Amino acid sequence: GSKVEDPKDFPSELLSFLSHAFSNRTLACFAIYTTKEKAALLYKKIMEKYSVTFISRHNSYNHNILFFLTPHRHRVSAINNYAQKLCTFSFLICKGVNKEYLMYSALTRDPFSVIEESLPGGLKEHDFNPES
């Protein structure tokens, strides 16, 4: 059952990069931790629902993580509610991302890896600095 089988949070390696609670603030970078099957579908649905500036899907052992950036700000609870209502099975953790570059970067390194992303070549530290 879910209490025994499901993760209750993101992998501990990533927790310092995430917002932890109080969804009155708005943010423009989010991550979703869920099963491989759900992440594959969600990659497209999130991209479409939120007209994302960038989205990437990553392997996380037996599961997947989505990382995405939006063109304007949203409440985490809004993104969570949308994601949860799409498929009514299996776990899904949705959190805001406070440290956007460190998160995406960590998601490209062992034990994680990129499965697919919306821009060829992905992102680099330069992209998280003000435009020249």
Curated annotation (Swiss-Prot):
Location of this chain's protein in the cell: Host nucleus
PTMs per UniProt: Phosphorylated on both serine and threonine residues. Small t antigen inhibits the dephosphorylation by the AC form of PP2A. O-Glycosylated near the C-terminal region.
DNA-binding region per UniProt: 11-125
Highest taxon listed in the record's lineage: Viruses
Ranges in coiled-coil conformation: none
Biological function: Isoform large T antigen is a key early protein essential for both driving viral replication and inducing cellular transformation. Plays a role in viral genome replication by driving entry of quiescent cells into the cell cycle and by autoregulating the synthesis of viral early mRNA. Displays highly oncogenic activities by corrupting the host cellular checkpoint mechanisms that guard cell division and the transcription, replication, and repair of DNA. Participates in the modulation of cellular gene expression preceeding viral DNA replication.
Note, other: The sequence shown is that of strain 776.
Subunit structure: Isoform large T antigen forms homohexamers in the presence of ATP. Interacts with host HDAC1. Interacts (via LXCXE domain) with host RB1; the interaction induces the aberrant dissociation of RB1-E2F1 complex thereby disrupting RB1's activity. Interacts (via LXCXE domain) with host pRB-related proteins RBL1 and RBL2. Interacts (via C-terminus) with host TOP1 and POLA1 allowing DNA replication. Interacts with host TP53, inhibiting TP53 binding to DNA. Interacts with host preinitiation complex components TBP, TFIIA and TFIID to regulate transcription initiation.
Domain notes: The J domain is essential for multiple viral activities, including virion assembly, viral DNA replication, transformation and transcriptional activation. The LXCXE motif specifically binds to host pRB, RBL1, and RBL2.
Stated name of the protein: Large T antigen
Source organism of the structure: Simian virus 40
Lineage: Viruses, Monodnaviria, Shotokuvirae, Cossaviricota, Papovaviricetes
Full-sequence range covered: 131 to 260 of 708
